[PDB]
Amino acid sequence: ENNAYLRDGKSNLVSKVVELHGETYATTVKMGLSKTPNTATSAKVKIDAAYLETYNKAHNTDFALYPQDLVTFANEGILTVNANTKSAEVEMTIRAGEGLQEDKTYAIPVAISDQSSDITIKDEDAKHCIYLVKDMRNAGDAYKGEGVMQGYLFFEVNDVNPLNTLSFQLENGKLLWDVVVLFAANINYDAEAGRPRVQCNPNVQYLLDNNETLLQPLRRRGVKVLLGLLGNHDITGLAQLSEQGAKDFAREVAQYCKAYNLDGVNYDDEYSNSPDLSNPSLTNPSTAAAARLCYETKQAMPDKLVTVFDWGQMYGVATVDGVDAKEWIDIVVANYGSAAYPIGQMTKKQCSGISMEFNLGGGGSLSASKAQSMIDGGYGWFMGFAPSPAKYGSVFSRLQGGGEVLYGSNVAAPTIFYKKNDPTPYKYPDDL
Ligand SMILES: CC(=O)N[C@@H]1[C@@H](O)[C@H](O[C@@H]2O[C@H](CO[C@H]3O[C@H](CO[C@H]4O[C@H](CO)[C@@H](O)[C@H](O)[C@@H]4O[C@H]4O[C@H](CO)[C@@H](O)[C@H](O)[C@@H]4O)[C@@H](O)[C@H](O[C@H]4O[C@H](CO)[C@@H](O)[C@H](O)[C@@H]4O[C@H]4O[C@H](CO)[C@@H](O)[C@H](O)[C@@H]4O)[C@@H]3O)[C@@H](O)[C@H](O[C@H]3O[C@H](CO)[C@@H](O)[C@H](O)[C@@H]3O[C@H]3O[C@H](CO)[C@@H](O)[C@H](O)[C@@H]3O[C@H]3O[C@H](CO)[C@@H](O)[C@H](O)[C@@H]3O)[C@@H]2O)[C@@H](CO)O[C@H]1O
Ligand SMILES: [Ca+2]
């Protein structure tokens, strides 16, 4: 008995979000084996359309099936066995189609099929992997290429309109900041429900209410918009939910990201007070509880980003219920002056190599030398916090030189900015 399971071969993820930026996307599907195979070991893979209803019910999702005629396995779906690496793989190609909708996630559930009798499949999870496909061909302006570093920017939305993301372009016209965070909605106690709830201050709520004009223009150009969550001075907190409390709060976060058509969350474990341990939604504060919340949030929105600030007790436990952090931490950004580090089977491609405090000044600059150092170190992200038009002189000074190294194109000097809650692009600096 040789136990098998399935995953995407390029990412090593059992659940993999695919962004189509061109007409084709190629990967491999990999079966991992627990023992050395023999000469007769064999298996195939197939799209398992029937499994999608089971998957959607389990995750409370509603993904449509990606058109099967657009998906091809090489070699009739037969997996080529590598006895020395205890694995077997086959190439899978995803073609972009006509009649697919923008801004919709489709699913390719893949199953092991026709396995030889020496292979044992423990359950339906091990039998399957899943691709969650989004057509990004037209929402291409933040996409700077394969393998480049990407930007992650927090807006203090109490003060600054996130449309200022659009102030930041390279000379080649690409948008610098791949991911932006609305900092921040809060976790707070709801006495009427006896559980935590998402609590949005009036500035956060105004953005959500007006997401068509103040948030969706970013997404139309390919920027991912995340809702920031932050502790907020009561017994609830992002690193102190029980298993049940985390499951419930994760569903509320996913419901915000669905209702307002956002791209995921940032969790920042700060400002909470000590929990009431008699409340069943709460538990002793711990990095294990934080990891539980991240895992449950990814299960509730597998198509969306689950990201963390590495501060407090938010990051560090590398498995939940046997599932490695690679499956439920998409990006981790560190405190100003530090570089993030991976846990579990994450790589530094999921990590920030610099965090720049744009309002107060700390964390260094995205210079040519720093860009090269971060590439050499294998980092995926650079993070910035609290840029504002009033400080664009400083902000853009700290971005000089790095873009030529990361992208072959420097960041251009700003010519537009946005005022709070106002969709109008104003002239920078004339209209300040
Ligand atoms: C990632 C990442 O970086 N993560 C963090 C990040 O969080 C840090 O960001 C900074 O955070 C700090 C701390 O914020 C948290 O606390 C404050 C204060 O909360 C307490 O007081 C409130 C009233 O003021 C109470 O309502 C609240 O309940 C708290 O009181 C309880 O607890 C204390 C004990 O701690 C007890 O004493 C009390 O009794 C009570 O029990 C809080 O306001 C913050 O929450 C708001 O903001 C977050 C988003 O950041 C939202 O998610 C929240 O909903 C909330 O906003 C809403 O409520 C507030 C009122 O609370 C409304 O005003 C608002 O409109 C919303 O409705 C957090 O819980 C902040 O202090 C920092 O703020 C400054 O910088 C930002 C920009 O980064 C500015 O937008 C902001 O205005 C602040 O700016 C001032 O200070 C700057 C220097 O720090 C300066 O550059 C600015 O020009 C400005 O200067 C002026 O004020 C100075 C004094 O503050 C003064 O010196 C100066 O002369 C000027 O007058 C910032 O957000 C970052 C930091 O790098 O790092 C990580 O740690
Ligand atoms: Ca910590």
TrEMBL record:
Domain called BT-3987-like N-terminal: residue spans: 1-118
Binding site for Ca(2+) 1: 138
Gene3D superfamilies: Glycosidases, hypothetical protein (bacova_03559)
UniProt cross-references to Pfam families, sorted A to Z: BT_3987-like_N
UniProt GO MF annotations: metal ion binding
PROSITE patterns, sorted: PROKAR_LIPOPROTEIN (PS51257)
Binding site for Ca(2+) 2: 312
Keyword annotations: Calcium, Metal-binding, Signal
Protein known as: Endo-beta-N-acetylglucosaminidase F1
